[PDB]
Ligand binder design. Structure first.
Ligand SMILES: [Zn+2]
Ligand SMILES: [Zn+2]
Lengths: 46, 107, 186
């Protein structure tokens, strides 16, 4: 079994290594995104 | 069926409003007007069996035939053997004999 | 209530039951095409299986990593944000990081090409990450919402929050212990 397809290169970036988070919503399905609803306040402790 | 609020994810209840029946949350203003026919079918299990039994062939699908009982000696028989009492070092048997429908049941 | 109810031998017509059942609930008061009576199609109530959200309407097999990368490459040119897990240590030395042989992660490496990804014949997918090849498997398939955000603290008290896109699929990487062990058996 030779690698018949897709010898895909894998890179690495560090410019967002300390800014990137991942917000996941356990109760909201993938169809009903929050892309349309306006937002008011965003608060965080680093 | 369970239906849950897109806002807070509590369970909805059915209530009646001024124009429609509504699914409504108990903890947030969200309501959903029932505009058209909505249904939920259970499809339970029916009582499938009728179950007649006790036939003679259902009685004599056991090994023994043409043996000898100490009472009426008939060939058509229905035997049994036990051992599950080790105070009884001898074996344990019980026999049914029904050629002439005499119906003995002894040790 | 009269108890001695009477019954008859006649056989019920199939359509007669069908049309009685039909007439019992096909009546609709949907004539009120009004604002209150109207309903927002993008805020339907959530039926519980999240893949199966639609209970009211206007009217599955488990994919694998080679089918995952084929649909994102051949079927569509559009890019997609993945979410891949790694093994606990990556097979490198921390480059002048003041150590002990501790864990080597992505936080210690540098920018540049880190490896190559080999999709083999018959569905085998490996991650050649140097001299060792890891193994890539599809993880548990999530079906809830996931958003990939950039939180930047440009000032001590204020900053920027930006959403980069939605993450759909989750990949899992694991070392091939049979091939690692078959080099020098023990
Ligand atoms: Zn609610
Ligand atoms: Zn007898």
């Amino acid at each position: 079994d030779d690698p018949v397809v897709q010898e895909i290169d894998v890179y690495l970036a560090k410019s967002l290594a300390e800014k990137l988070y991942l917000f996941q919503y356990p109760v909201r399905p993938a169809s009903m995104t929050y892309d349309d609803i306006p937002h008011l306040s965003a608060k965080i402790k680093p | 069926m369970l239906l849950f609020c897109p806002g807070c994810g509590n369970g909805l209840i059915v209530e009646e409003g001024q124009r429609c029946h509504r699914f409504s949350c108990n903890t947030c203003p969200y309501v959903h007007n029932i505009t058209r026919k909505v249904t939920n079918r259970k499809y339970p299990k029916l009582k499938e069996v009728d179950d007649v039994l006790g036939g003679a062939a259902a009685w004599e699908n056991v090994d023994s035939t043409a043996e000898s009982c100490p009472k009426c000696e008939h060939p058509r028989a229905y035997f049994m053997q036990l051992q599950t009492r080790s105070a009884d070092e001898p074996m344990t048997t019980f026999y049914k004999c029904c050629n002439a429908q005499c119906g003995h049941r002894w040790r | 209530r009269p108890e001695v109810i009477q019954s008859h031998s006649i056989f019920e017509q199939g359509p007669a039951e069908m049309m009685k059942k039909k007439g019992n609930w096909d009546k609709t008061v949907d004539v009120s095409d009004m604002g209150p009576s109207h309903i927002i199609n993008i805020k339907k109530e959530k039926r519980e299986t999240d893949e199966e959200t639609k209970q009211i309407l206007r009217m599955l097999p488990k994919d694998v990593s080679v089918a995952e990368l084929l649909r994102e490459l051949s079927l569509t040119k559009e890019e997609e944000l993945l979410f891949l897990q790694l093994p606990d240590t990556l097979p490198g030395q921390p480059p002048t990081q003041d150590i002990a042989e501790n864990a080597c992660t992505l936080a210690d490496l540098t920018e540049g090409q880190v490896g190559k990804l080999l999709i083999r014949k018959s569905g085998r997918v490996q991650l050649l990450l140097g001299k060792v090849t890891l193994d890539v498997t599809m993880g548990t398939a999530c079906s809830f919402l996931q958003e990939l955000v950039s939180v930047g603290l440009g000032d001590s008290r204020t900053g920027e929050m930006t959403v980069l896109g939605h993450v759909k699929h989750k990949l899992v990487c694991s070392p091939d212990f049979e091939s690692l062990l078959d080099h020098k058996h023990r």
